[PDB]
Amino acid sequence: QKHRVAPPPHVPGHLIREIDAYDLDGLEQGFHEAWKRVQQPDTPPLVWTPFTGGHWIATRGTLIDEIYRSPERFSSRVIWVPREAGEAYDMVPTKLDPPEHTPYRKAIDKGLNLAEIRKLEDQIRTIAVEIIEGFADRGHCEFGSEFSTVFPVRVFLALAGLPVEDATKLGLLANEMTRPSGNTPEEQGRSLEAANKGFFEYVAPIIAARRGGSGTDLITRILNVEIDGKPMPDDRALGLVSLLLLGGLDAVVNFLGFMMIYLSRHPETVAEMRREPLKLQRGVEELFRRFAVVSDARYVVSDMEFHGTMLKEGDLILLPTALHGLDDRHHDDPMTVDLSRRDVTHSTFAQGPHRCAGMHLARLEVTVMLQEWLARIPEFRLKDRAVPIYHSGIVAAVENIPLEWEPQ
Ligand code: HEM
Ligand SMILES: CC1(C)[C@@H]2CC[C@@]1(C)C(=O)C2
């Protein structure tokens, strides 16, 4: 049964569209394909859905980009739908606007900046190689369970100085954050609340132990950056360390799944990467344009008119980032990966002050993955008649990716 909310007085009937972000129409054909169904040639730039507590959806890249760049008009005080889940959300600094946001982003950047991430290249490669060598000679693997859910998790837990045996419990918490269970806005609120508490419980003893610590891990490094000339307060620390874990463990895992399904269906594109290693390296951003996974929200700060649409203070707008990278008004033939594409502009990492702090790490993980994969498994395909299983939500997910190849 679908839960509907009635539209508020300011929402006109002509803008109403029945779109369920947690179970998109057509999702069985793919997450990206399902979102693209919403973006028809004449659909309005902002449409309102009665599902998920009732909210707006931005349907074009220019709006998505503009909203992310405009925190004074579109606040991060709520960035999840439904509203109940967004109000329960307690991660730092994603819940903050400038200027409160900036010293915390500065702290994170101390650990995740490009120069710091470059130092990680060989550790990441060693991890990728070890995993790939486990199955490269076999001629088949289920890519999700055997690689994409393994590689980025081992990378991040190592970087954070945490036991790999914690992967399962952290993954379960991530699932309920980004794809909370429930068929009602209040049920999803409760699911997110419990997940966020689980993260806080996990992170608290680590914080207590690493304050003033001498560890070289990511958490110690960021935790001990001063905020306004003082140690970071406890409440902020819980949200900050929890966000590092959530950011590091869900998005890349799912991104790799979507990317690999495409590559398994496009051997010409794989072959180009093999023949021209610089095309691979320079082409990674095109993969980020094509395989967006995040759809999150902003809070309308004041009554306003925006792109010809009347908005009220407190309205939530969902930003499905796939609708920037795949917007046909921004990119010709947007569903094809063209490694030589000159304009790859996208909001896969969002825009503005919150633009992904882990983007350098994400790019490096993907680059290293493709390099070590193609070195050992140069050609591959999706198993005949295989059907991947898709999930939509704040972060998209995919599973069941059986790959086959002739061992080289
Ligand atoms: C495919 C990979 C990734 C994608 C698509 C992605 C996407 C995003 C997006 C859209 C945001 C903006 C959220 C918002 O404010 O609405 C964000 C923020 C953030 N991401 Fe990533 N992310 C990825 C990987 C990572 C990784 C590996 C980390 C490592 C810790 C990370 C850490 C963060 C952090 C800390 C923020 C908050 C930055 C701030 O609020 O100033 N992300 N990410
Ligand atoms: C939307 C995100 C990808 C970004 C980092 C992790 C995530 C789930 C957040 O809560 C903010």
**CA angle, corner 55, sides to 50 and 60, nearest 5?**
115
3-state secondary structure of 399: strand
Q: Which residues pair with 300 in a beta bridge?
A: 74
CA 246 – ligand 2 centroid, Å: 7
Ligand closest to the CA atom of residue 98 = 1
Ligand showing the shortest atom-to-Cα distance for residue 353: 1
Burial code (b: 16+ CB inside 10 Å, e: under 16) for 96-114 equals bbeeebebbbebbeebbee
Helix (H) or strand (E) holding 207: helix 185-210
**235: containing domain:** 1-408
Say yes or no: CB of residue 178 within 6 Å of ligand 2.
yes
**For residue 387, with 0-12 CB atoms within 10 Å meaning exposed, 13-18 middle and 19 or more buried, which class applies?**
exposed
What six digits make up the tokens of 149?
């859910």
User: Among the atoms of ligand 2, which is closest to the Cα of residue 174?
Assistant: 8
Q: Which atom of ligand 1 is nearest to the CA of 68?
A: 16
Contact yes or no for 293/390 (Cβ under 8 A): no
Q: Which amino acid is at 214?
A: S
Distance CA 49, CA 383 (A): 37
Residue nearest (by alpha carbon) to ligand 1 atom 27: 248
Name the pairing type of β-strands 309-311 and 304-306: antiparallel
Cα–Cα distance measured from residue 220 to residue 107, given in angstroms and rounded to the nearest whole number: 11
Query: Rounded to the nearest whole angstrom, what is the distance from the C-alpha of residue 203 to the centroid of ligand 2?
Result: 17
How many Å apart are CA 14 and CA 20, to the nearest integer? 18
Ligand located closest to 284 CA: 1
Kindly identify the ligand whose nearest atom is closest to the C-alpha of 175.
2
SS3 159: helix
Residues in the chain: 408
Ligand 1 centroid vs 356 CA: distance in angstroms?
4
**Is the CB of 247 inside a 6 Å radius of any atom of ligand 2?**
yes
Which DSSP string corresponds to 14-78? GGB----TTS-TTGGG-HHHHHHHH--TT--SEEEESSTTSEEEE-SHHHHHHHHT-TTTEETT-
Number of Cβ within a 10 Å radius of residue 4: 13
**Is the C-beta atom of 108 inside 6 A of ligand 2?**
no
SS3 content of the chain, % helix, strand, coil (to 5): 50, 10, 40
Those residues whose C-beta lies under 8 Å from the C-beta of residue 337, and which sit 6 or more positions away, are: 262, 266, 269, 283, 286, 287, 290
Q: Is 298 annotated as a binding residue?
A: yes
Tally of structural domains, the chain = 1
Helix, strand or coil, per DSSP, at residue 306: strand
Resolution value, angstrom units: 1.8
Return phi, psi of residue 153, to 5°: -70, -45
Which residues have CB under 6 Å of ligand 1?
Answer: 76, 79, 93-94, 105, 108, 243-244, 247-248, 251-252, 255, 293-294, 296, 321, 348-350, 354, 356-358, 361-362
Domain CATH for 203? 1.10.630.10
Q: Do the beta carbons of residue 24 and residue 391 sit within 8 Å?
A: no
Count of Cβ atoms closer than 10 Å to residue 322 Cβ:
31
Q: Give the chain's radius of gyration (CA, Å).
A: 21
Does the beta carbon of 347 lie inside 6 Å of ligand 2? no
Method: X-ray
Contacts (Cβ under 8 Å, ≥6 apart) of 322: 31, 32, 35, 36, 292, 293, 295
Secondary structure (DSSP) of 84-133: HHHHH---TTTT--TTTHHHHHHHHHHHHSHHHHHTTHHHHHHHHHHHHH
